[PDB]
């Protein structure tokens, strides 16, 4: 049989499909096969180009500094509304109900119970003072739900599930849902139309984002970020690594952004655990954190409560509703534009050291999903993003002069001054900042990249990187050329709609571009 060879012949339908799937100008695949096997092109490309219209071209235009303009001018316009606070939890306003504890780790329900027990005035408060009901939520629903939360937390039983199970159903709006019918009736009925897409609002630059950026990037006497031990370091390289790691954690641990990140991670871990354990029953979840002071006292901090709805979901993209009540010391009337989504009370006051300050409860309904729910416990990677780059920075310095500089860049030595970056500005005057402060700024930038992250943020960053690299090329006098600048600008600015971090990133980008323009004179 070796004189035959393989046999693989095409049938009728496939042969016909081949016959009709030949480029234009042919009438059979045998014709195309013969044409390809025989005809020889000896400049067909040039013949086609010699006739193609001269109205097609990359439009190569050299790019100068003047062409670059601020991105998203509409944020400056004051006619648009101030951007609201849409993050899951309060960041720079959290009020920590702090109880000193020997160190024992206890269930969150018992911890919240004890924390409220210490503060009897707030635990037993039952007559609210509505400061503002935002637009739609009902004050009665939210207040009764919060009272049920407090009663459940303070109840003797270890169970942490709502004892009402019926009032919450309407407080959370679970019952306010449409009922699905079959396709036939929808076809027959004339009033069953299609909802128009809901585009995000076009907002302006707020002010709370800048203040939170400043405040979360400052040292605090309280530290929460703790990390597990590792094995003894015997090689010199791991000794250097340990020194660098210590110098970094001594800086990051005491910034408030670290505490906020740990609070987010713990809350999302607890939310995932409750959802997996409890599926179709409303649950109560304290927003717990653990904070060690410089003296080693392991305070447990209760930041509020949250009602979890019915999470019985087979898929991951399915949404589960949760309502958050948050203790805070900020009266929203100081800036009502930051809190258009929040219905708040005034549940009392407290003394931290003798200076009485009010205590309000911010109540808001929200919704999450298993994806964001998991990413909450993966938000710790911000820390890594904060170290990598700084590591590189330090390594670059080490490349210059032989010895190790991690003490020099941070604190300086007798031979090298402490390393200072450009961090902020005031009255048009840019200000420097220590190495630790720059590390804090980067860590807070990563944390915000997470918390305010959505499709808009991705579309903004991945498309403004084009302008970032173009500016980098210009600063090196590579004379970069561009093909369609307005196209890139439109692509970038079609993402600055309502994300507070996106709007502030656009604002800072414009300010920094102005600074680079003014400094390019040299």
């Amino acid at each position: 049989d070796v004189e035959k060879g393989i046999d693989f012949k095409l049938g009728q339908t496939i042969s016909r499909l081949r016959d009709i799937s030949v480029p234009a100008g042919f009438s059979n695949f045998e014709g195309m096969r013969s044409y390809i096997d025989n005809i020889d092109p000896k400049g067909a490309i040039e013949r086609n180009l010699a006739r193609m219209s001269p109205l097609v071209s990359v439009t190569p235009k050299k790019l100068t500094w003047e062409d670059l303009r601020p991105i998203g001018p509409h944020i400056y316009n004051h006619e648009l509304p101030e951007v609201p606070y849409n993050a899951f939890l309060l960041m720079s306003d959290e009020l920590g109900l702090a109880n000193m504890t020997e160190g024992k780790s206890k269930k969150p329900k018992t911890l919240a119970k004890e924390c409220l027990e210490k503060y009897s005035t707030l635990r037993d408060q039952t007559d609210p003072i509505l400061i503002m009901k935002s637009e739609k939520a009902n004050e009665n629903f939210l207040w009764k739900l919060w009272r049920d939360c407090v009663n459940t937390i303070s109840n003797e039983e270890m169970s942490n599930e709502l004892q009402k199970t019926n009032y919450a159903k309407w407080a959370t709006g679970d019952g306010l849902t449409y009922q699905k019918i079959m396709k036939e009736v929808a076809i027959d009925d004339e009033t069953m139309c299609q909802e128009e897409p809901k585009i995000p609002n076009k907002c302006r630059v707020a002010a709370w984002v800048q203040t939170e950026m400043n405040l979360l990037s400052t040292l605090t006497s309280k530290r929460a970020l703790d990390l597990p031990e590792i094995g003894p370091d015997v090689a010199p390289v791991e000794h250097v690594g340990s020194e660098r790691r210590k110098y970094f954690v001594n800086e990051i641990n005491y910034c408030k952004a670290s505490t906020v990140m740990m609070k987010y991670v713990l809350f999302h871990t607890s939310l995932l655990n409750e959802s997996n354990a409890s599926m179709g029953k409303y649950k109560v979840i304290p927003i717990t954190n653990r904070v060690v002071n410089e003296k080693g006292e392991s305070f447990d901090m209760l930041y509020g409560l949250a009602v979890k709805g019915q999470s019985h979901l087979r898929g991951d993209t399915d949404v589960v509703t949760v309502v958050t009540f948050e203790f805070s010391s900020t009266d929203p009337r100081v800036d009502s534009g930051k809190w258009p989504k929040y219905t708040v009370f005034r549940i009392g006051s407290l003394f931290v050291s003798g200076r009485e300050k009010s205590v309000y409860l911010y109540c808001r309904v929200n919704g999450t999903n298993k994806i964001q729910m998991k990413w909450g416990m993966e938000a710790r990677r911000c820390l890594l993003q904060s170290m990598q780059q700084m590591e590189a920075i330090v390594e670059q310095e080490s490349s210059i002069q032989g010895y190790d500089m991690t003490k020099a860049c941070f604190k300086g030595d007798r031979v090298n001054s402490p390393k200072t970056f450009s961090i902020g500005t005031q009255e048009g005057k840019l200000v420097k900042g220590s190495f630790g402060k720059a590390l804090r700024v980067i860590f807070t930038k990563c944390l915000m990249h997470y918390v305010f992250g959505n499709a808009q943020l991705e579309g903004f960053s991945a498309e403004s990187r084009r302008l970032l690299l173009l500016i980098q090329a210009l600063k090196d006098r590579k004379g970069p050329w561009v093909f369609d600048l307005e196209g890139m600008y439109s692509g970038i600015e079609e993402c600055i709609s309502n994300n507070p971090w996106v709007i502030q990133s656009a604002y800072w980008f414009n300010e920094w571009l102005g600074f680079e323009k003014e400094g390019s004179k040299v």
């Binding site: 009709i20 590792i230 990677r381 993003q385 990598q388 997470y450």
Partner: protein
């Protein structure tokens, strides 16, 4: 003072701090996909609407042919590719390489004659026509094999992929087509059964040519959503063969970024830029175009790929030439399924209902939203009555990556047009190209860039004038890797890989530590960063498996037992991090499994208990994943109590037959068995021998022997 993170770039280059720009820590965007699929179909036909519009007489679906069509007169994307220019580029590539086409085609044919049908089980989810859904590749292949048995189709039992492709091509001619369909019969309960269903020839052709669609939700750095298409099993063999051929061709091509991955790609990038810097004339300029192609698959006609396949196999057996040309034919007449349909609701009655796609036009268009109104008013011409869109021109993303890369490299390699005083060369990989143009001044550099752009427009390639820019050589980006002054920062994007691998304790730990060490080797992760990554990973690993340090006062079910073990055993430095032991891993010993690492520090009782030869937590069938961790990553672990498996979330026929064969011939689970005889007789002979040996050794009683032999005789083998 007002802080500003962007000011970091005042004192640092962007490339150095590029990692912070990307928001690869937040929640990636996630999602109906019917709107996106309809929009993709609309755009694909719009770009080629000027071609030749005809009606397929094999399927009855409208087809648009842009090839050899009018030359575009505008910058808008064009799928009008001239065949002669494609053949010219292929001929230039052939001249520039010694018989590369022949060698690649011959090697593809040889490896094809050795390929088995079961290779089609790999990959991702595939469209199944017996149910018209998306099912795992293995299940879809099994179902199609089962269905073919009914209509007098065979070749799967014959082994190799040649008979399977032959009888697949035969199936397109059978006047009917019988198969098993799922019937969710009401009994109230919904019980699924198998119902012998039949479909005609036209319906079967449409089903085979249909391309199922889904939303590409996993994307990270794109605001607007794209739709990914999954094809049926009847195209997988041909697409696989053509892709292997294109890979063979492109691997030799120094201009191709694929299929090499990792530090190899960086090596290629740096070598190419160094080469171009060397080749520059005296005082001339070598400009680099950072390009990011768009509509890379909505402009590539499958007819051009058919022509490329025919030209590539210029000298090869006629049977192979016909076989490898089937995939372009199937793709040139493909059909696209359309999501799950739009949803219409009335708020005055709190009513909502999803409208299946087949009923798209059963409703007055005045009820859809204006945008979907226009979409349907434009999609009507190509809409099939069954609820599918006729999508002949263009390609869906991910099918011909290698072939499209080869076409791009063909465009790159022309290297000159009209003998103008310039040259060009570059790197191309699956929708990402970086070009280098050398000349004696900037003006000639852009003359060359424009010429290359025009030449690309003659093949259906349309470089994005909005996502691309040009600068001086020595600073650019390729596939998210940044090159600047010789410094290639591996953009730190492997951050979302430090979570537990979710396979088991020891395996998860080994995978995590190997990931850390590989990142240190490749991405330049600093020693402090690696130590902190070890710390964070150990924290997450302890939390996820509810096993913290025994000393710590944390409460838990397993935590109480860990506490007990903490003092019930003296040697406290030998416990595992899964047993509340102290972490011992550091940079110097990320390459050693901890079980061997702590072997000395353990206690005799502890090591005896943990490393027992037999563990009810360890099973033979659980060993499948001991080699590769799902990308198949190799990890080193140690057999022990912590090597367990999680609970599960003609099927039984094949499954239990294979399981029993493995249990009989324990060597089968490791290496492919060999034999030209029925499985039954092999098992019968082996079991007879084993029974005799068990008795002769006293391990089996006489009544047991007689029962076994009676059963074997009943089997008909004694």
């Amino acid at each position: 003072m007002n802080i500003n993170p962007y000011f970091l770039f005042i004192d640092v280059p962007i490339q150095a701090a590029i990692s912070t720009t990307f928001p690869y820590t937040g929640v990636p965007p996630y999602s109906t996909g019917t709107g996106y699929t309809i929009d993709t179909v609309i755009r694909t036909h719009e770009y080629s609407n000027k071609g030749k519009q005809y009606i397929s007489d094999v399927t009855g679906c409208t087809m648009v042919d842009p090839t050899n069509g009018p030359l575009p007169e505008d910058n808008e994307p064009s799928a009008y590719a001239q065949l002669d220019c494609v053949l010219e580029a292929l001929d230039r590539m052939d001249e520039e390489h010694p018989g590369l086409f022949q060698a690649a085609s011959q090697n593809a044919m040889e490896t094809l004659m050795v390929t088995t049908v079961d290779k089609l089980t790999q990959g991702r989810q595939t469209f199944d026509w017996t149910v018209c859904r998306n099912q795992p590749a293995a299940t879809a292949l099994n179902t199609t094999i089962t269905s073919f048995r009914l209509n007098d189709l065979n070749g799967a039992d014959k082994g190799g992929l040649i008979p399977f492709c032959q009888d697949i091509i035969d199936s397109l001619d059978r006047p009917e087509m019988t198969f098993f369909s799922v019937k969710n019969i009401k009994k109230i309960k919904r019980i699924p059964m198998k119902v012998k269903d039949k479909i005609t020839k036209v319906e079967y052709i449409k089903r085979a040519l249909s391309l199922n669609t889904m939303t590409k939700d996993a994307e990270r750095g794109k605001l607007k959503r794209r739709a990914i298409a999954t094809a049926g099993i009847q195209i997988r063999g041909f697409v696989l063969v053509v892709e292997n051929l294109a890979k063979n061709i492109c691997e030799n091509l120094e201009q191709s970024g694929l299929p090499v991955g990792g530090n190899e790609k960086k090596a290629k990038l740096s070598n190419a830029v160094a080469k171009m810097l060397s080749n520059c004339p005296p005082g001339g300029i070598s400009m680099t175009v950072t390009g990011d192609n768009t509509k890379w698959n909505e402009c590539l006609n499958p007819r051009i790929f058919l022509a490329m396949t025919e030209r590539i196999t210029r000298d090869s057996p006629i049977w192979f030439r016909d076989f490898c040309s089937i995939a372009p034919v199937l793709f040139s007449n493909k059909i696209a399924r359309l999501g799950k349909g739009f949803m219409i609701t009335s708020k005055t009655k709190r009513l909502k209902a999803q409208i299946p796609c087949p009923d798209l036009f059963s409703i007055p268009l005045e009820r859809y939203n204006e945008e979907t109104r226009a979409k349907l008013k434009k999609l009507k011409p190509f809409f099939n009555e069954e609820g599918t869109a006729s999508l002949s021109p263009g390609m869906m993303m991910g099918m011909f990556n290698m072939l499209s890369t080869v076409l791009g490299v063909a465009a790159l390699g022309i290297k000159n047009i009209g003998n103008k005083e310039y040259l060009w060369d570059g790197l191309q990989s699956s929708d990402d190209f970086a070009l280098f143009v050398n000349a004696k001044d900037e003006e000639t550099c852009m003359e060359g860039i424009n010429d290359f752009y025009r030449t690309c427009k003659l093949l259906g390639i349309n470089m994005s004038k909005k996502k691309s820019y040009c600068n001086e050589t020595g600073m650019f980006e390729f596939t998210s890797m940044f090159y600047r002054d010789g410094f290639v920062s591996n953009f730190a994007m492997e951050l979302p890989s430090f979570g537990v691998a979710g396979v088991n304790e020891s395996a998860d730990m080994a995978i995590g530590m190997t990931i850390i060490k590989n990142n240190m080797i490749n991405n330049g992760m600093g020693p402090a960063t690696a130590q902190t990554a070890i710390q964070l990973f150990i924290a997450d690993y302890r939390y996820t498996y509810k096993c913290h340090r025994g000393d710590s006062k944390v409460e838990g079910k397993r935590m109480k037992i860990i506490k007990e073990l903490w003092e019930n055993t003296k040697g406290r430095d030998g416990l595992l991090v899964a047993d509340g032991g102290p972490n011992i891993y550091n940079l110097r010993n990320l390459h050693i499994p901890e079980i061997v690492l702590k072997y000395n520090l353990m206690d005799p009782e502890y090591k005896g208990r943990l490393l027992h030869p037999q563990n009810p937590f360890v099973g033979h069938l659980s060993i499948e994943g001991i080699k590769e961790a799902d990308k198949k990553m190799d990890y080193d672990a140690v057999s022990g109590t912590h090597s367990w498996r999680t609970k599960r979330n003609e099927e039984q026929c094949y499954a239990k037959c294979c399981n029993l064969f493995e249990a009989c011939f324990n060597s089968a689970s490791y290496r492919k068995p060999v034999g030209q005889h029925s499985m039954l007789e092999a098992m019968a002979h082996r079991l007879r021998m084993d029974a005799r040996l068990d008795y002769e050794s006293g391990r089996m009683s006489k009544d047991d022997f007689e029962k076994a032999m009676a059963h074997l005789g009943e089997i008909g083998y004694i």
